[PDB]
Amino acid sequence: LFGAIAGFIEGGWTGMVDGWYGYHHQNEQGSGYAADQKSTQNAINGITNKVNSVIEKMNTQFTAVGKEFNKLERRMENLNKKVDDGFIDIWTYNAELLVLLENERTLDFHDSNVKNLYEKVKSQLKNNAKEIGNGCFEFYHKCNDECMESVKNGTYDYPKYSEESKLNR
Amino acid sequence: DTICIGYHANNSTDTVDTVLEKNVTVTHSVNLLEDSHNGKLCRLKGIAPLQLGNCSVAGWILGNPECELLISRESWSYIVEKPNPENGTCYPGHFADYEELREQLSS
Amino acid sequence: APMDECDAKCQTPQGAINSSLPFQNVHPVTIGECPKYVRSAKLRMVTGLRNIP
């Protein structure tokens, strides 16, 4: 719904195991995966609270079922069966619709998180990097593990590399 | 030097249904439906159930001569009766308000 | 069903259930703190992403 998952980022990464969203970097010092702890933590908080909140809205059944009626009490038996079946039908509808709608909303939520992470990195980098379009940025300046870690941590120093990136651009 | 933003994929086969799609494979999921059971009657908060056996509630409450093993039992969590009890009221006749008595004894 | 020596929280005519899950599809008749009976065969809620490996 937001275009990140199955959009400009086509497939997933089986090499990342420590987070739902993260980064894949490749510099002269090597290649590696990392997980965005902040975004994944926010997603875990949201998903946990949503699931639990949905569950506690349904108080656990603390009663019993079962009744018996004689031959001359057919109307009572029909009324009791109608009450039971109607309650079961209403609760089945509630459960099924809730799962469907919440599943769509959860997938949209993860999509939004990936899109927001992409936009955060893009806004930090500005014109110091080139947007290839598959979810990747190609830096116009040489970047080591320190500046990679700055990009992941959000402390990218744009003015420091501005002069070098401008020349290469 | 390149940095790429992406997400997590694994070897799961768990599937969910959405409004837009059916049978969507997902990385993680929770099951909110219980389908399995022990298979045997068990105690509830310690108090043992009262299994009347071959006799029904009428036979239990009138003291049918052919099931006296329920006389000793005085506390229970629930009563278990056979689907078609046979050792009920030995002397034929009508038990007035039988279903009402069952409701009263259910609590 | 036969009688065991369990310490269960829910009892159905087919057997006992020991779960904190909110729903069940075993039997409408229940005794104790039991999940709500539903007629579905699958209620799975997604917590993760789409799997595209």
Partner: antibody, heavy 127, light 107 residues
Framework: VQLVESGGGLVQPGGSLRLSCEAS????????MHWVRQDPGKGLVWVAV????????DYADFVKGRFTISRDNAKNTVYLQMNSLRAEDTAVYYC?????????????????????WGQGTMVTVSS | IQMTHIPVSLSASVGDRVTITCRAS??????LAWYQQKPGKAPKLLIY???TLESGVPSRFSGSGSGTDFTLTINSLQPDDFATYYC???????????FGQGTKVEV
């Protein structure tokens, strides 16, 4: 289900000790295992944690290479080796089990905290 | 992360509502667990996720709160509820396990 601890005793400062928990009633291959300690009369503080495979282990701030954690799922036991002990490390050590998380290590629905604790092994450091 | 108790000690009579408040140095969402320890014994877990009750714990216990401030309430205090209560911030992700200083409930 219970956890039994052994190995606690009196050790001189700058010594070594090995504490062990054995679990009965459940297989601990599907549980994170935690080591906490309580000073006599004081509160509870957390020492170490070991995963369900032994790959990921974490230790508290006051222990800097002094302690090493280990686990044997086949034998249903979890071990903690303390070396270079000091007088501060004098307390009752508890073994706690924590359910493995549904997603990563986070449990979304079900038990989440330290459900089952040990009995306590007293570790004394003195001359 | 630091977790603090209010009050440090709290004396109340039997049958009286009690309230222990645990405050965090940051926002820890609903990652709280309330434990109870009687002298010379291992703690027993009362509440997890700041609202959910462990199986077997009496319903007289209640949990409440999110973010930075949380609360355990023992309505209808009973003699077996005189112990030391601990609030623990647990986060398997980010690997953060921290215990509170502790509160004492006396007569």
């Amino acid at each position: 289900v219970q956890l039994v601890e052994s190995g606690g005793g009196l050790v001189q400062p700058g010594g070594s000790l090995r504490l062990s928990c054995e679990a009965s009633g459940f297989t601990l291959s599907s549980y994170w295992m935690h080591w906490v300690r309580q000073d006599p009369g004081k509160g509870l503080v957390w020492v170490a944690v070991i995963n369900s495979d032994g790959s990921s282990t974490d230790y508290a701030d006051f222990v800097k290479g002094r302690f090493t954690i280990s686990r044997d799922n086949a034998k249903n036991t979890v071990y903690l080796q303390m070396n270079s002990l000091r007088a501060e490390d004098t307390a009752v050590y508890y073994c706690a089990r924590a359910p493995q998380g549904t997603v990563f290590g986070v449990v979304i629905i079900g038990a989440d905290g330290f459900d089952i604790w040990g009995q306590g092994t007293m570790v004394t450091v003195s001359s | 992360i630091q977790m603090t108790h209010i009050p440090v000690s709290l004396s109340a009579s039997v049958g009286d509502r009690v309230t222990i408040t645990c405050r965090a140095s940051q926002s820890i969402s609903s990652w709280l667990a309330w434990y109870q320890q009687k002298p010379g014994k291992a703690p027993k877990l009362l509440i997890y996720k700041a609202s959910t009750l462990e199986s077997g714990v009496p319903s007289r216990f209640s949990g409440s709160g999110s973010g930075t401030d949380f609360t355990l309430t023992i309505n209808s205090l009973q003699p077996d509820d005189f112990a030391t209560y601990y609030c623990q911030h647990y986060n398997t992700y980010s690997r953060a396990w921290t215990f509170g200083q502790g509160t004492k409930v006396e007569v």
